[PDB]
mmCIF file of C-alpha atoms and ligand atoms in Angstrom:
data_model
loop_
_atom_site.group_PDB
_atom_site.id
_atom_site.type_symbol
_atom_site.label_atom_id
_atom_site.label_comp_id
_atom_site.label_asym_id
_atom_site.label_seq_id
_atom_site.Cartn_x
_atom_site.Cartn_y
_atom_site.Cartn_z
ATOM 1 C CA UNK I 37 120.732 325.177 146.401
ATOM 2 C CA UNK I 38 118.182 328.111 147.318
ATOM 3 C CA UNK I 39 114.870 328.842 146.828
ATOM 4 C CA UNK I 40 113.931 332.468 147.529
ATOM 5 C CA UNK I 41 109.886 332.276 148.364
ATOM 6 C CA UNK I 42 108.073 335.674 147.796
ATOM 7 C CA UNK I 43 104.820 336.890 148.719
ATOM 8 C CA UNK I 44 101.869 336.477 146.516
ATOM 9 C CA UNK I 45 100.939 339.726 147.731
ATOM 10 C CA UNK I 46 103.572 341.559 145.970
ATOM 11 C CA UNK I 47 102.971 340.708 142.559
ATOM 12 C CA UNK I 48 100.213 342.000 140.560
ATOM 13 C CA UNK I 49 99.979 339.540 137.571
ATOM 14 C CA UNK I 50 99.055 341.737 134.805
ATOM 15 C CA UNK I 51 98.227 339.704 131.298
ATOM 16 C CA UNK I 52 98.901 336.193 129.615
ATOM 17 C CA UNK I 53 102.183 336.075 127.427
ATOM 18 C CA UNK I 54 101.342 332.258 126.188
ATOM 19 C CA UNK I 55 99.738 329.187 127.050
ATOM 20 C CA UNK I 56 101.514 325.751 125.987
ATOM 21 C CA UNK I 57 100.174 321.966 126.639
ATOM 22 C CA UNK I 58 102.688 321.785 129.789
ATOM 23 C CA UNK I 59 101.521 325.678 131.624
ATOM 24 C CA UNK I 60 100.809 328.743 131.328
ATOM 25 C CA UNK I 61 103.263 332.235 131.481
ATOM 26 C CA UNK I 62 102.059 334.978 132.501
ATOM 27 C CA UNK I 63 103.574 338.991 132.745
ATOM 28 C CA UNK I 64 103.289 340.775 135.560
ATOM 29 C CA UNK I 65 104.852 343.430 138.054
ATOM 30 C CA UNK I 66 106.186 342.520 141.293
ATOM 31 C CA UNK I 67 106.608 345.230 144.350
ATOM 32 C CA UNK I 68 108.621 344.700 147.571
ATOM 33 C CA UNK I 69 111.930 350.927 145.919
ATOM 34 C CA UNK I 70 111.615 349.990 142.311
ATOM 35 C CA UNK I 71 109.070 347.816 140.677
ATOM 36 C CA UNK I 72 110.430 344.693 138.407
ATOM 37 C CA UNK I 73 108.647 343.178 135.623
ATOM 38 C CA UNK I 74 108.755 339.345 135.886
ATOM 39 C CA UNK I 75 107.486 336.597 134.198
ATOM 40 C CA UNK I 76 105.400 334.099 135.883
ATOM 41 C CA UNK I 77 104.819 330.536 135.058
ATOM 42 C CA UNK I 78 102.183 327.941 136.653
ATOM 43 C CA UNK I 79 101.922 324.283 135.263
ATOM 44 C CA UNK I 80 98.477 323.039 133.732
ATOM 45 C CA UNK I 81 96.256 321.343 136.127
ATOM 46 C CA UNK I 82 97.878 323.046 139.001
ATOM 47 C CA UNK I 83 95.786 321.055 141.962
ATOM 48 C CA UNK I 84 97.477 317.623 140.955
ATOM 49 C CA UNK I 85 100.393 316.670 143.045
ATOM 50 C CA UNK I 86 102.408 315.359 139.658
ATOM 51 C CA UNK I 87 101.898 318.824 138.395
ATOM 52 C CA UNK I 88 103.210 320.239 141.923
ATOM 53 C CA UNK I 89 106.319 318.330 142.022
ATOM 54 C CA UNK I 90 107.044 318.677 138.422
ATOM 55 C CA UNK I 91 107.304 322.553 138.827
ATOM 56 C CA UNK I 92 109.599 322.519 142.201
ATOM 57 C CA UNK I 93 111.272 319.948 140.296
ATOM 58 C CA UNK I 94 112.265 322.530 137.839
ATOM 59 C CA UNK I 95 112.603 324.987 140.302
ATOM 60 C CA UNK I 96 115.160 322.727 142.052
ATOM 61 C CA UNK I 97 117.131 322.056 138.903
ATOM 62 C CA UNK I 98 117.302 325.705 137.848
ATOM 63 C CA UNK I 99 118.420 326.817 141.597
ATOM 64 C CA UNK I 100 121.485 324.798 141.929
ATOM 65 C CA UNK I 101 122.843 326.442 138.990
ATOM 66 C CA UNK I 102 122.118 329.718 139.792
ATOM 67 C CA UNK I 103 125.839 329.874 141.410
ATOM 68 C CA UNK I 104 127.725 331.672 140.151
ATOM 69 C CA UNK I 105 124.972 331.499 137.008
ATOM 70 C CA UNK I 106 125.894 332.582 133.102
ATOM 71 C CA UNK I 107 124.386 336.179 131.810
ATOM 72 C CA UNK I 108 122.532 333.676 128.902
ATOM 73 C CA UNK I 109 120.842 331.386 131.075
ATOM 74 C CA UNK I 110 117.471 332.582 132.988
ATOM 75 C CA UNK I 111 118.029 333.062 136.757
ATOM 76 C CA UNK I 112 114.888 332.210 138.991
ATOM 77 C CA UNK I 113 114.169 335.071 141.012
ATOM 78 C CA UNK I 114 111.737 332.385 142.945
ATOM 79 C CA UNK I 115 108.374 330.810 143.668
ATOM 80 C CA UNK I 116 104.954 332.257 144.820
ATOM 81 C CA UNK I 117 102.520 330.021 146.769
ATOM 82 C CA UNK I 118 99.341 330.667 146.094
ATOM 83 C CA UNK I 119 96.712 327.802 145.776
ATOM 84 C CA UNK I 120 99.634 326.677 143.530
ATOM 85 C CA UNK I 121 103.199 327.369 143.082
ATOM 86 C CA UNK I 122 104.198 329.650 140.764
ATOM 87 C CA UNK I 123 107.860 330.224 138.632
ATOM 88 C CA UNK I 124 109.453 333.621 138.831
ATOM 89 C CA UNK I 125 111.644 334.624 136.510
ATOM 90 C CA UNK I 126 112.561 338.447 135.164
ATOM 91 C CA UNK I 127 110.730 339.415 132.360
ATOM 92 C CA UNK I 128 112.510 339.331 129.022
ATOM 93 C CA UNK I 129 111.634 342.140 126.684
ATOM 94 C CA UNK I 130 111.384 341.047 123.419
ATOM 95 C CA UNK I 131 110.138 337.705 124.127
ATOM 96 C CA UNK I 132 111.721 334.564 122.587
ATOM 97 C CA UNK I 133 114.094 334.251 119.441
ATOM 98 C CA UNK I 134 111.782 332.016 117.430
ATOM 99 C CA UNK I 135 109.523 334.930 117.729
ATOM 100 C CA UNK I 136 111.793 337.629 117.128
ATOM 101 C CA UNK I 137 113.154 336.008 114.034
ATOM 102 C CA UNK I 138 110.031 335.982 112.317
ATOM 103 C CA UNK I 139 108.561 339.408 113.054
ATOM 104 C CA UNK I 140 112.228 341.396 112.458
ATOM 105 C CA UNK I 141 113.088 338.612 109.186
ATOM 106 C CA UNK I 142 114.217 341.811 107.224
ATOM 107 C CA UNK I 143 116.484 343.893 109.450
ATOM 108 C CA UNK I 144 118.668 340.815 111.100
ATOM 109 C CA UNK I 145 122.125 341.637 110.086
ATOM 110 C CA UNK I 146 124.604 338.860 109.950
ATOM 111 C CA UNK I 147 126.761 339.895 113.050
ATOM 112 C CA UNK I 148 123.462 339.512 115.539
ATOM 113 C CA UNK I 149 123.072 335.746 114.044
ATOM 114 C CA UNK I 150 126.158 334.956 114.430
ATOM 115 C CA UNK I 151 126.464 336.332 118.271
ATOM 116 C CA UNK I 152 123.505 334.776 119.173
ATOM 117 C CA UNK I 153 124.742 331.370 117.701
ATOM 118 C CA UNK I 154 128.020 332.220 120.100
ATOM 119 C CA UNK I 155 126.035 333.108 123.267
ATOM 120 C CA UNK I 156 123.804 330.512 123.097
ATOM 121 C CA UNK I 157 127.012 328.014 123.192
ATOM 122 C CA UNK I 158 128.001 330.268 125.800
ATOM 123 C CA UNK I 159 124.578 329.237 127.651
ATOM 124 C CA UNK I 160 124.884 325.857 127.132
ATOM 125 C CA UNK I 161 128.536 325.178 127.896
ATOM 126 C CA UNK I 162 128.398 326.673 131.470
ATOM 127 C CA UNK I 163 124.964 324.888 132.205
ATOM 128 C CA UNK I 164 127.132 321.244 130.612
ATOM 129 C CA UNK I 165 130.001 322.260 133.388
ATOM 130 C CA UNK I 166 126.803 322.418 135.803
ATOM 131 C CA UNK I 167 126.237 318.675 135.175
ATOM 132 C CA UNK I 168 122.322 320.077 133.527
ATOM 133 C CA UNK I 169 120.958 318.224 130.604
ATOM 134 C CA UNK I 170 118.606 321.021 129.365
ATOM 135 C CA UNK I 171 116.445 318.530 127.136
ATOM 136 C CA UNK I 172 114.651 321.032 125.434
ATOM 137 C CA UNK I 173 116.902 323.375 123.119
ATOM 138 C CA UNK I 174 114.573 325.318 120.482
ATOM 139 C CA UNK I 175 114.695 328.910 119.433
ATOM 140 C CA UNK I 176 111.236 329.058 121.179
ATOM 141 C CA UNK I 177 113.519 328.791 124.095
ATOM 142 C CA UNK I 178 115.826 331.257 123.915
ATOM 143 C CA UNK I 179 114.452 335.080 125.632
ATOM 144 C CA UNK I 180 116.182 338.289 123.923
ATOM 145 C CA UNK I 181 117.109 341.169 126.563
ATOM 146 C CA UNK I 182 117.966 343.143 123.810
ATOM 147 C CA UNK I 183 119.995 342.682 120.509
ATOM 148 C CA UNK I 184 123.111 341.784 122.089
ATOM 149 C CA UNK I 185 121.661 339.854 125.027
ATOM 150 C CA UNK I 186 120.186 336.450 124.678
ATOM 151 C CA UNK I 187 119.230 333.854 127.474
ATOM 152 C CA UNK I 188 118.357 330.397 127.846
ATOM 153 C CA UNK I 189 115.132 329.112 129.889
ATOM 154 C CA UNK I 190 112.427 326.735 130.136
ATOM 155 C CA UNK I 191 113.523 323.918 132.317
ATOM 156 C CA UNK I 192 110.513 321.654 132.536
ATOM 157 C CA UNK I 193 112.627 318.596 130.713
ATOM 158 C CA UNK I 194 116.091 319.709 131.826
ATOM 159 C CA UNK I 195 117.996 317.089 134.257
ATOM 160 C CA UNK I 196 121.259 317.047 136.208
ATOM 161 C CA UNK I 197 123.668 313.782 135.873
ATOM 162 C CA UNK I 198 124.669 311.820 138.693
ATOM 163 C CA UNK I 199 128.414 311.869 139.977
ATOM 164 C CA UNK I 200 129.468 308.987 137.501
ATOM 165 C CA UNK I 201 126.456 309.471 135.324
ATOM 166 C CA UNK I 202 126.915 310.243 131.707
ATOM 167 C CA UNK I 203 123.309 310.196 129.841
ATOM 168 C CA UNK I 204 119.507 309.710 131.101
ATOM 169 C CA UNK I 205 116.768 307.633 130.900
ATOM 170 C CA UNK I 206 113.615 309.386 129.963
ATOM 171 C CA UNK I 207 110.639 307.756 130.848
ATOM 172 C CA UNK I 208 109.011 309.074 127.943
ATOM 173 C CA UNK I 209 106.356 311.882 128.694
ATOM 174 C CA UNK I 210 105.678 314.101 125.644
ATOM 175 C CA UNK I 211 108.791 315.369 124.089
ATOM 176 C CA UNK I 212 109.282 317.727 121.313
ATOM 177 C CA UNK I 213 110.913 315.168 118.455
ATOM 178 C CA UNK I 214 111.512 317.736 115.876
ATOM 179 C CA UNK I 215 114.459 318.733 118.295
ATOM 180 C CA UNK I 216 115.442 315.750 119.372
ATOM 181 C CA UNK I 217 118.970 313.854 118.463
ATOM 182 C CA UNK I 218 118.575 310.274 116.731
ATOM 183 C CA UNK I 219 119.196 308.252 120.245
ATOM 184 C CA UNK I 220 116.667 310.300 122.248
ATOM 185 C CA UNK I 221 114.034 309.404 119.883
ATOM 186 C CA UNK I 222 114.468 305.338 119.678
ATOM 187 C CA UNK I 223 116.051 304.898 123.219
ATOM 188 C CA UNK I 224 115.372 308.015 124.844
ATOM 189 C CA UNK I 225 118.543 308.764 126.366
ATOM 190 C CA UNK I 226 119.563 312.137 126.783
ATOM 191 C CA UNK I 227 123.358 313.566 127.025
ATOM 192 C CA UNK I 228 125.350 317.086 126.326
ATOM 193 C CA UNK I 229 125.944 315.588 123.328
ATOM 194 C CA UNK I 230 121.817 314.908 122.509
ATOM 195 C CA UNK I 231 121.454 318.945 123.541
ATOM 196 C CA UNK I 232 124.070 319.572 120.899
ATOM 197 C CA UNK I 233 121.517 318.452 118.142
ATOM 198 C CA UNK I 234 119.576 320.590 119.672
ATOM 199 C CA UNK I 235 121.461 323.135 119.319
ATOM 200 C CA UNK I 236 121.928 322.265 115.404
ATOM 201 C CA UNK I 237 118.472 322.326 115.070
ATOM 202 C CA UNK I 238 117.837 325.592 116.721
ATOM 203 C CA UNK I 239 120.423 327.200 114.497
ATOM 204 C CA UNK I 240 118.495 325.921 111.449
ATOM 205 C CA UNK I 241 115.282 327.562 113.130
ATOM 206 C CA UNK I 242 117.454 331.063 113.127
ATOM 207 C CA UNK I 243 119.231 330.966 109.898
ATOM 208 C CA UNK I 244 116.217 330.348 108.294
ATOM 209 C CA UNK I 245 114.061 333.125 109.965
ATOM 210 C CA UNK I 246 111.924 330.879 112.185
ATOM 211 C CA UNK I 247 110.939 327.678 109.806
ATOM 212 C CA UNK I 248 109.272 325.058 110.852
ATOM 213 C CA UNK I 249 111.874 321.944 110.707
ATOM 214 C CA UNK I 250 110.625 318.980 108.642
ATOM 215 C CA UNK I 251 107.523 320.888 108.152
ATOM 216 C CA UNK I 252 104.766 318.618 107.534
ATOM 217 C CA UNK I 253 106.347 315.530 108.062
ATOM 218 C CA UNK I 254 104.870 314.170 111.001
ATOM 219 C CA UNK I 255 106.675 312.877 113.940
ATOM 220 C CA UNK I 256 106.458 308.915 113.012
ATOM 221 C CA UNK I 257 108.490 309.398 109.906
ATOM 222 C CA UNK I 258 111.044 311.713 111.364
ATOM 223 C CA UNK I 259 113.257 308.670 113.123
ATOM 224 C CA UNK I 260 112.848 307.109 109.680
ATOM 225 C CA UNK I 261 114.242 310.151 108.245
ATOM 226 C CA UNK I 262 116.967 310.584 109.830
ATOM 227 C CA UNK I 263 118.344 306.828 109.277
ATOM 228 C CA UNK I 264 118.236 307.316 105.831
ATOM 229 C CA UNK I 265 120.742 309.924 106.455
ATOM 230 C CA UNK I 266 118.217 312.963 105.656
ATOM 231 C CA UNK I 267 119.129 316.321 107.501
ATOM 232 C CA UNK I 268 117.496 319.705 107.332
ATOM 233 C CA UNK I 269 117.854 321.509 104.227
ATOM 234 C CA UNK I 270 120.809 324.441 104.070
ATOM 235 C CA UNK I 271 119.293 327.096 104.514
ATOM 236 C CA UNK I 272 119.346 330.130 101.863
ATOM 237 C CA UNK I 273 121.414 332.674 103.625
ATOM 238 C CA UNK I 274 124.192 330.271 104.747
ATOM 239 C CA UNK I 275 127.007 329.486 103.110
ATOM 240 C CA UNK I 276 128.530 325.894 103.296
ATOM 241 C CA UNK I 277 131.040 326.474 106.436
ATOM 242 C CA UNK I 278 128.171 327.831 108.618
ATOM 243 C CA UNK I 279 126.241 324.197 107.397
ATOM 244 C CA UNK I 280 128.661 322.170 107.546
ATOM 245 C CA UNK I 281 128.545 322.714 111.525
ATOM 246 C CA UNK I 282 124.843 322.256 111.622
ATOM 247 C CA UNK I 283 125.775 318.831 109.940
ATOM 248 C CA UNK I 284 128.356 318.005 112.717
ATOM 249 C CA UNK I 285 125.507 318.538 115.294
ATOM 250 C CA UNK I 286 123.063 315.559 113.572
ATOM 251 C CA UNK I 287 125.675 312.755 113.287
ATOM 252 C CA UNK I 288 124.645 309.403 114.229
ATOM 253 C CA UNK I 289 128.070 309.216 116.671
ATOM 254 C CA UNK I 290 127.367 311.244 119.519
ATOM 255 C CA UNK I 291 130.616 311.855 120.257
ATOM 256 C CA UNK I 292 131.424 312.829 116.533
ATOM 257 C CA UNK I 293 129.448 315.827 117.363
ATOM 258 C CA UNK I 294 130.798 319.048 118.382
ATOM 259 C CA UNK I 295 131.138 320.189 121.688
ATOM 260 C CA UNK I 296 129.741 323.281 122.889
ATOM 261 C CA UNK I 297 133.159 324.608 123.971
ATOM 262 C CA UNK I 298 134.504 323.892 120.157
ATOM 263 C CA UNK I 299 131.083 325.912 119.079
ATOM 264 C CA UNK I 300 131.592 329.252 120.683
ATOM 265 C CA UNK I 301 135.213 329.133 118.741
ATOM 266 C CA UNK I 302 134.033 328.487 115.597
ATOM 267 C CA UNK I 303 130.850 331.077 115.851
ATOM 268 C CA UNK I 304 133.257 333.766 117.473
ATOM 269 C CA UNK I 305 135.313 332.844 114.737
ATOM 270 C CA UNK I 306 132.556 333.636 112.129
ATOM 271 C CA UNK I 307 131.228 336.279 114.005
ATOM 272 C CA UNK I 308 134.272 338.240 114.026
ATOM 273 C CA UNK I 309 133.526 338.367 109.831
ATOM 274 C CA UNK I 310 130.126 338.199 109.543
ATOM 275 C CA UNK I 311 129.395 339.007 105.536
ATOM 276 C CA UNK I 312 132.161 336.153 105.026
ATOM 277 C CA UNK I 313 129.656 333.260 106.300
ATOM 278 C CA UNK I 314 126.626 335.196 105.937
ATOM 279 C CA UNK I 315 124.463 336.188 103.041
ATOM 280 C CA UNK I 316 122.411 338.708 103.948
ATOM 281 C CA UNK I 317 119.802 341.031 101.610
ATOM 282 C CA UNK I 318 121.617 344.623 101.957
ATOM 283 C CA UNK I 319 123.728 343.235 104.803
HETATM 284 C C1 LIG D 300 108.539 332.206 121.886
HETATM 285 C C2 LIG D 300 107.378 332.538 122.792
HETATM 286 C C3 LIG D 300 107.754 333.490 123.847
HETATM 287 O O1 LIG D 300 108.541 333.179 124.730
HETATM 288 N N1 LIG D 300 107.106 334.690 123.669
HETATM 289 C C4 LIG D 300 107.194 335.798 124.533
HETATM 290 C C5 LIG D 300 108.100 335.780 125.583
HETATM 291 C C6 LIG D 300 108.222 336.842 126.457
HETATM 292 N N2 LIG D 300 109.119 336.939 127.547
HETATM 293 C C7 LIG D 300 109.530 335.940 128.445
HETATM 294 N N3 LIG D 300 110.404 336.283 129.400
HETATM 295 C C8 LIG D 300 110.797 335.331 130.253
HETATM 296 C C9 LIG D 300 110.356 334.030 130.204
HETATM 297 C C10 LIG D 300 109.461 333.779 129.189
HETATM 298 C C11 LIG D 300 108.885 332.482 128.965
HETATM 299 C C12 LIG D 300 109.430 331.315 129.453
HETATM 300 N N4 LIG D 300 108.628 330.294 129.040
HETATM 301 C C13 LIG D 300 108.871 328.904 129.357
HETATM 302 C C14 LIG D 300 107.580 330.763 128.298
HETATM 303 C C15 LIG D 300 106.538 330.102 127.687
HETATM 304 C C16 LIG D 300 105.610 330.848 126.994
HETATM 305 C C17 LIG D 300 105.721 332.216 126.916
HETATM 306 C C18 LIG D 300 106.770 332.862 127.532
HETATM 307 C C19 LIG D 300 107.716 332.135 128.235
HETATM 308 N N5 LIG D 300 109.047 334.704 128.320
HETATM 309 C C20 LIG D 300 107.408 337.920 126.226
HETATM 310 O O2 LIG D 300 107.505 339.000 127.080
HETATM 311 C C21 LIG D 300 107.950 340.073 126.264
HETATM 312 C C22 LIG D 300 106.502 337.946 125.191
HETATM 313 C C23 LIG D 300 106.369 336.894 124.312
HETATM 314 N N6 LIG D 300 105.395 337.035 123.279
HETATM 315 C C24 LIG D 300 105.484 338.354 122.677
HETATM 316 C C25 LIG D 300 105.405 335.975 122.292
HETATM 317 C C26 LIG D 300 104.026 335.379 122.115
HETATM 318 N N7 LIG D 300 104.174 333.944 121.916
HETATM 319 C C27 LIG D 300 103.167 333.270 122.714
HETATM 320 C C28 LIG D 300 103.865 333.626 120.531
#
């Protein structure tokens, strides 16, 4: 478990990329031959000493599963000290998937779906046989390289399990609900299988182009919701095999869901036929 410090000198942090509640990213060259374009991250309120651990927290937790790593899971490059400490992280291109989904809706051929959907599982699986409870799964979360390259990131929430440890006990800060599996909203414990939902959910977000989930329904009701037994809609491009996994992801028993090894099967499965699961305009 390594942190590499670098020099504030060497970076030259050139615009804003997007400000949430929790921080701020920012773009930005850095220059110890070559110059590489990172991406640079500083919590909000960055004087506090709860907003100082929170972000070496995450650094910890993201550098003691940077060995051997995953090619679809974010490497730190390291941290800056400034007034502040600041996240480094290389730059991906094309920003995140949520994004990408939206702007490109009418060129995303089934076979890019349906890879993402496998490298994503890919992502997670390695980061489960780290012992790493990502807690924050979204399609917001997921950076594109290019096309056939997708990572994970963001680990502000994510935790790793004790030895003999098998969930965890959030004491609830703000949480993203619309993401969140059944348990983690009354009880707020948080497991693989918890990130799994996640998953589900995220899949919805991509099959569907980037829709809001439950959109406007607001986060009371959503527990409520769900007991009732209500799921996200299929979506229109999907046919039933493809949403019949999403529906594996939101069952009540945890351990009814899926597992992230038994995803990347069934989506390399699919993704090996891609117009056979997918429905597609001019695929
Ligand atoms: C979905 C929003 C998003 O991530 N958008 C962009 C991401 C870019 N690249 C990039 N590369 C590495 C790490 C991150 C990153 C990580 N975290 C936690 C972020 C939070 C907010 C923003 C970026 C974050 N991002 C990127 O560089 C190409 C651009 C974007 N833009 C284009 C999307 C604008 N978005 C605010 C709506």
């Amino acid at each position: 478990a390594l942190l590499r410090i670098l020099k504030e000198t060497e970076f030259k942090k050139i615009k804003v990329l997007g400000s949430g509640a929790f921080g701020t990213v920012y773009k930005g060259l850095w220059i110890p031959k070559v110059k590489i374009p990172v991406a640079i991250k500083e919590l909000r309120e960055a004087t506090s000493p709860k907003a100082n651990k929170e972000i070496l927290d995450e650094a910890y937790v993201m550098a003691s599963v940077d060995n051997p790593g995953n090619p679809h899971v974010c490497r730190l490059l390291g941290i800056c000290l400034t007034s502040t400490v600041q996240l480094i992280t290389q730059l991906m291109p094309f920003g995140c998937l949520l994004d990408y989904v939206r702007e490109h809706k009418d060129n995303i051929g089934s076979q890019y779906l349906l890879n993402w959907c496998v490298q994503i599982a890919k992502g997670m699986n390695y980061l489960e046989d780290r012992r790493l409870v990502h807690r924050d799964l979204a399609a917001r979360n997921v950076l594109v390289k290019t096309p056939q390259h997708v990572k994970i990131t963001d680990f502000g929430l994510a935790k790793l399990l004790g030895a003999e440890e098998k969930e965890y006990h959030a004491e609830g800060g703000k949480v993203p609900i619309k993401w969140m599996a059944l348990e983690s909203i009354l009880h707020r414990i948080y497991t693989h299988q918890s990130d799994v939902w996640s998953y589900g959910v995220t899949v919805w977000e991509l099959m569907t182009f980037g829709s809001k989930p439950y959109d406007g329904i607001p986060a009371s009701e959503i527990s409520s919701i769900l007991e009732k037994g209500e799921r996200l809609p299929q979506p229109p491009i999907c046919t039933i095999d493809v949403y019949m996994i999403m529906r594996k992801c939101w069952m009540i028993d945890a351990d009814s869901r899926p597992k992230f090894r038994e995803l990347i099967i069934e989506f390399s499965k699919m993704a090996r036929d891609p117009q056979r699961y997918l429905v597609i305009q001019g695929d």
